[PDB]
């Protein structure tokens, strides 16, 4: 029974540090207002699940040693239910984390709208409901099975037993393993696919304008669609939809496609460059610029039009003579800046530096992405052997040796060990987290 | 038997366009010297497999219609063997493609060494050997099974039959589905993790120097290790290993760790900046520069040392006065340029532009990565339903309805349809490929 006792020891470490760590994490998330972010809401869900599983650990270890389940019927139902709930909610939360990461990175303008932590709370609730769809019947079908001279807290079914058992094994195998992993993989691939640094004007302006496929009132309150493409001053939707129909050639109903937006984009960019070329105030300043600053100029022409950018005589003067800090200061004193300060700040920085540093993303995204990725990898390493082992046993017979039981309980074990591994990871891969940890320690 | 006839029609389309397409692809790869790249070698392997499966298609359709296998014993063995070989070699090739992509992107300096197409050919061979480990016994255990009034080309086993059958199902399920998908996922995650554009000096210099963890003779023929960190002029390894031991503090034996290289890196970068600061010729030119050009200066000090970069009076003059094209031209006429032209070209471009455009990667990488990613996604969409369906049937009983057989043969069908889907994809996601296609068409 050395296996049983080593299981007890290992499980004691996992239980103590697991509970301690997850309680610490949840408490920290709840307590500080700085710690309340979408990522941290998801992390909270994860920590909750882990805390529950670890809570059920000590009852299992004494089951190992006694050879019986003393704790009754209801507590058993609770235990198994918590087991399944953990298995589901964990990987589902990892999924929502991968999706949220993908959104935060590949769709920043859209990200700022719905990446509020309340949405993370909502999707966490939905996670728990979907998981309730499997967890509740498991809680119902769990009971105490009496045997010759022992007691079991197994999940039992009516005849044919192997049927319902293996059916459950299928459902968990598809929904709690295959599908979520596939979703994560798609998120990652799509992420590599849609992530690329900004070195040109087209990328630059999309950061400034965004991809909105429906007609929306802009900052100035005018009906707009695509990437910053303006339609009409009038408030009526038809005069905007008919202009959209005119710009496209087919009846839009107020909705276009990505290719139609990209096509609408390129013509506006060239129309801006064209407009510059026919302007005797702009065209000279145009050729005096490096590509980065030339892009900044097109950005202004894109926004307010050629006639408006024409009346920037002194800023244009300073630009043509290459007086950068002078021009930047003068540009910051315009009504343009007063209207759209953040965008103007980026463009002015582009004029001043000749570098793209006003656009390139913060390192926070990279750090959090790294964190989530590593967490996911650890989870996969911990849960893959058991998910596979179960399916294997379900459909073939294994030559009973001590090695079989050792490997089996080892897989179950590490499957539980993930739960105590998690908070330790939060410390290393997150600076605010290790900061909170230090605040609790020092 | 409408199912059988529609299967025949569908399979005729898949067979004709599949064979045509894959033969076309393979021929194009073989014929042109421009088409011989690592990516295209992998693609060749894929096309080969697909061509084989499609080759086995027509024999199956007549099996559907006749209700018997007329084609004998050997041809049957061939068919099933080809089936399994396709299933394995395809996804293995996708794996090697994801790995090669990851290498090409995240380790360019290392990439240029072993991304020769001969290595792709070698790994293709190994792919076929690993796949031979499962394909050969399948070819042996395949035979003609006679029944009441029909004939089967099934794979049959001795008693217990379900045991060996389900065992095979397990092995294919782990090795031809789970594990490869996991490997791909790890490649993608690691890719996002190690991919980031260049905006600072540390990234810049790593591009120029590379991460080599063993002591190697550099371009100048001196013993070097880490990121461009020099050791000794002497040819003896000990005097280099002892210097490495001295630089680290523990006995290295000529091998360090990534953290030790990164630490060795930061001190050299600052030592360069320090050296500049104590130089009355360099320090003035230092403060006159924007961050990008300041990085270029550190790059030179890193390479040839403070004393060498001191004797660039005229280039330094032109730099301080901000005469960029002048300085760039003058720098290109140095013995520095004559020695290491490619690196010097990048640094000079950095001095001339103030932008990082000499470092940012080619769009070819992005395009090919996109291609491979999309191919992989399509494959997953095509092979997932059947891989799952098989496991399901292996361990539970399905209520026999027409819907069951329809869905089943539909899954098998699309599983075969991937093979004809592939070459069409090569046309869209690759410009050289659609160019070859046009050369064959127009
Ligand atoms: C059925 C056959 C059997 O031997 O039951 C004793 C079976 O293996 N059910 C598993 C046992 C392991 C399990 O309690 C674990 C691991 C896991 C993975 C997959 C899956 O289908 C099943 C399981 C569980 C339920 C979930 N817990 C999760 C904790 C990490 C260990 C049963 O269902
Ligand atoms: C065993 C039970 C059965 O009903 O045999 C008739 C079984 O399902 N074996 C599968 C049938 C399908 C199969 O011929 C296909 C698909 C596939 C996927 C998984 C896997 O384990 C097995 C298979 C094959 C062998 C591979 N081909 C690949 C072609 C794309 C269709 C058998 O083994
Ligand atoms: C790190 C991850 C990806 C690896 C996946 C682990 C899986 C594939 C490995 C790890 C441990 C392995 C099991 C260890 C013990 C046994 C008992 C033996 O009599 C039959 C094989 C069997 C059932 C193995 C099946 C495959 C197995 C479950
Ligand atoms: C696109 C990919 C990721 C989706 C995965 C497809 C899988 C999960 C789906 C697609 C078709 C589905 C099968 C369709 C037909 C049947 C017969 C039915 O009596 C039992 C369910 C069963 C066996 C389904 C099992 C699940 C199934 C195999
Ligand atoms: C913190 C709450 C106390 C948990 C103790 C479990 C104690 O659990 C144990 O000691 C078992 O050996 C673990 O399975
Ligand atoms: C059996 C388990 C069932 C789990 C069901 C889902 C619960 C988990 C969902 C979201 C986690 C909550 C994070 C903290 C915000 C709410 C508490 C702190 O409150 C706040 O600060 C808000 O502003 C107002 O509530
Ligand atoms: C090209 C080679 C000829 C292949 C014909 C298969 C012809 O195959 C067929 O016609 C069957 O219907 C497909 O299963
Ligand atoms: C039953 C299938 C067994 C498959 C075994 C592995 C074969 C596939 C491996 C590599 C693909 C070859 C690509 C073309 C290069 C060799 C032919 C063209 O030759 C060349 O041009 C070379 O320079 C010299 O050979
Ligand atoms: Cl960036
Ligand atoms: Cl780049």
UniProtKB/Swiss-Prot annotation, chains A, B:
One of its GO terms (cellular component) is endosome. Keywords: Cell membrane, Cell projection, Disulfide bond, Endosome, G-protein coupled receptor, Glycoprotein, Lipoprotein, Membrane, Palmitate, Phosphoprotein, Receptor, Transducer, Transmembrane, Transmembrane helix, Ubl conjugation. Disruption phenotype: During adult neurogenesis in hippocampus, increased numbers of granule cells maturing into neurons, larger granule cell layers and increased numbers of granule cells. Residues 28-40, 100-119, 190-367 are cytoplasmic. A motif (NPxxY) lies at residues 422-426. Residues 66-76, 142-164, 395-402 are extracellular. A lipid is attached at residue 441 (S-palmitoyl cysteine). It is a multi-pass membrane protein. Disulfide bonds join 76-153. It is found in: Cell membrane; Cell projection, Axon; Perikaryon; Cell projection, Dendrite. Phosphorylated. Differentially phosphorylated in basal and agonist-induced conditions. Agonist-mediated phosphorylation modulates receptor internalization. Phosphorylated by GRK2 in a agonist-dependent manner. Phosphorylation at Tyr-102 requires receptor activation, is dependent on non-receptor protein tyrosine kinase Src and results in a decrease in agonist efficacy by reducing G-protein coupling efficiency. Phosphorylated on tyrosine residues; the phosphorylation is involved in agonist-induced G-protein-independent receptor down-regulation. Ubiquitinated. A basal ubiquitination seems not to be related to degradation. Ubiquitination is increased upon formation of OPRM1:OPRD1 oligomers leading to proteasomal degradation; the ubiquitination is diminished by RTP4. It comes from the Eukaryota. The modification Phosphotyrosine is found at residue 102. GO terms for molecular function: beta-endorphin receptor activity; G protein-coupled opioid receptor activity; G protein-coupled receptor activity; G-protein alpha-subunit binding; morphine receptor activity. Receptor for endogenous opioids such as beta-endorphin and endomorphin. Receptor for natural and synthetic opioids including morphine, heroin, DAMGO, fentanyl, etorphine, buprenorphin and methadone. Also activated by enkephalin peptides, such as Met-enkephalin or Met-enkephalin-Arg-Phe, with higher affinity for Met-enkephalin-Arg-Phe. Forms homooligomers and heterooligomers with other GPCRs, such as OPRD1, OPRK1, OPRL1, NPFFR2, ADRA2A, SSTR2, CNR1 and CCR5 (probably in dimeric forms). Interacts with heterotrimeric G proteins; interaction with a heterotrimeric complex containing GNAI1, GNB1 and GNG2 stabilizes the active conformation of the receptor and increases its affinity for endomorphin-2, the synthetic opioid peptide DAMGO and for morphinan agonists. Interacts with PPL; the interaction disrupts agonist-mediated G-protein activation. Interacts (via C-terminus) with DNAJB4 (via C-terminus). Belongs to the G-protein coupled receptor 1 family. This is Mu-type opioid receptor. The chain holds residues 65 to 352 of 398 of the full protein.
